[PDB]
Amino acid sequence: QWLWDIIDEFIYQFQSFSQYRCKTAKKSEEEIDFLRSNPKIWNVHSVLNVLHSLVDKSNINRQLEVYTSGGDPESVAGEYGRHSLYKMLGYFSLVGLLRLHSLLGDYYQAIKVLENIELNKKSMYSRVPECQVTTYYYVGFAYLMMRRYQDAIRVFANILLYIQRTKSMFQRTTYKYEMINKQNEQMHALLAIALTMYPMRIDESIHLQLREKYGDKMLRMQKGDPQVYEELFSYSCPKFLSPVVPNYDSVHPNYHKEPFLQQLKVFSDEVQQQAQLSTIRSFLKLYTTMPVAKLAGFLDLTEQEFRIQLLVFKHKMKNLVWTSGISALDGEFQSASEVDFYIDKDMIHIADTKVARRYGDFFIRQIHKFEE
Amino acid sequence: AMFEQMRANVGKLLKGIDRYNPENLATLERYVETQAKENAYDLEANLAVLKLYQFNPAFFQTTVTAQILLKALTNLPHTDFTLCKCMIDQAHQEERPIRQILYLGDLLETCHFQAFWQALDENMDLLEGITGFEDSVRKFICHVVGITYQHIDRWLLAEMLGDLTDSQLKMWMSKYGWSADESGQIFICSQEESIKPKNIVEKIDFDSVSSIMAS
């Protein structure tokens, strides 16, 4: 009862404020102007937007994942709760992007994604690191869903770096500080499995404490064990969807695991054959143009007799991960071995290091201010 | 030409609050068949019907989802068909004709084109009933041939396209300008034109790095 005394009092206070949101932003200049003046912080005004991003999503996820029939939650929020706030004229501040990226978050859990196009187009206001890191969060996830593994893996690198010149300080990632650490860790780990004999960019993204364990995971996954298919997929699911609260686990109510059938089994199909793409590339491409010695050496390696070695070989070159040609008279297999790049880290660091100098020189000149 | 007469209407439907209202399925399920029959496409209208079907599983209609699924598979290697299974329920992937359509879809992603045309059942008149579908999948076969072959044998390219005859293959030969070579393969692409490496070449980033190191 204490459970749904808290839950219901969030939504009823948000439904209250939703009317104030629509009322102030659009037309009442003097009410906005009166609100600019009185406090020393306009931070109180702005926080309440994306504070209610993740708290409302929790409360609606509970009501979603308790009532699976005669749907009250999902059409009320979708119609009224979300579109009224966002579709109409933005408040003049970062609040226009806050309500945008609150809506982008709400739009993310729903698996209907195609208006990521126009959400970026309506992000007219400048990309502050606060708004930008949370844009690249979802935009990278959108590329992860687009099967643009090579694009998305770069986008996850920067947001996990912790020299995007974040400083926070006053609770703008609060109570989920390490979610940004572990979700970017996790979703980057899936992308490494698909392609990698290219980056050589994983050094920047993830630190060696985790690179060591996730490194051996990919190898153990693709080569010799489907065990990593399990444990990777266990950690990947809470982070792929982001279901903010799983409901109280008990057998007396059912009500909760039924949505989790869909939610989970939706992502089963993702990692299923995308993982089995990996093992083909896993065997290093030892000799770039393969004669009879190496082509048969690789067709001994693909699968054994008899039936249907060549067919399966020529099915898998198509996907994205080989570029090659067949010759008839020679009987020769000629192929493409492409590689990435060595050092791209140093020249990106040359400014980052100078920020270690800068905020060094600056913070002590704030202490040199005080004790002088 | 009913596709062109619903674009403006359905465009404002799918940007409003009518894409989480189930009542709009009248105009929307009609417009889904208008894609399939008239050989046109709109991902958003499909995905909204799929989302409204995911909302209330009872309103799911098998043929309307087949008209989504089949036309998703013409548009590969895009993630249109990825977004289909994401909204289609556990119950709803075991329906007819859905189960056969999904299995055939799996073959196209893993690019088992030989197995695709073997797998076909020819008594399902719905798969004949989608206009330009039989050629669309063939155009996607030849699309990926161009990306990852430098040559292909005449018998080989035939078999991938459903065991074509000599005369049937003349269309596909002419389509991307492909032509015969000595003994006796069909040319697809030049060897240096296919590979396209963008590998080792950087460390030419002097200008920016000196502009920031200027002071």
Question: Brief overview, please?
Answer:
Chain A has helices at 2-26, 29-37, 43-64, 73-87, 95-109, 116-121, 129-145, 149-158, 179-195, 202-205, 208-224, 228-240, 257-276, 278-282, 292-302, 309-316, 346-370; strands at 289-290, 324-326, 333-335. By secondary structure, chain A is mostly helical. A three-stranded antiparallel beta sheet of chain A has the order 1-3-2.
- Helix-strand category of chain A: mainly alpha
Assembly category: part of a larger assembly
What is the N-to-C succession of helices and strands of chain A? HHHHHHHHHHHHHHEHHEEH
Count of beta strands of chain A: 3
Describe the strand arrangement of the main beta sheet of chain A, using strand numbers. 1-3-2
Main sheet record of chain A: 3 strands, antiparallel
Largest sheet of chain B: 2 strands, antiparallel
Number of helical stretches of at least 4 residues of chain A: 17
Radius of gyration of chain A: 26 Å
Distance separating the two termini of chain A: 57 Å
Cα-to-Cα separation, first versus last residue of chain B: 64 Å
Radius of gyration of chain B: 22 Å
- Strand arrangement within the widest β-sheet of chain B reads 1-2
Helix content of chain A: 55-70%
- Write the element-wise H/E pattern of chain B from the N-terminal end onward: HHHHHHHHEHHEHH
Strand fraction of chain A equals under 5%
Give the overall shape of chain B. Answer: globular
GO molecular function (chain B): ribosome binding; RNA binding; translation initiation factor activity
Keywords (chain B): Cytoplasm, Initiation factor, Nucleus, Protein biosynthesis
Domain PCI (chain B): 41-203
Organism (chain B): Oryctolagus cuniculus (Rabbit)
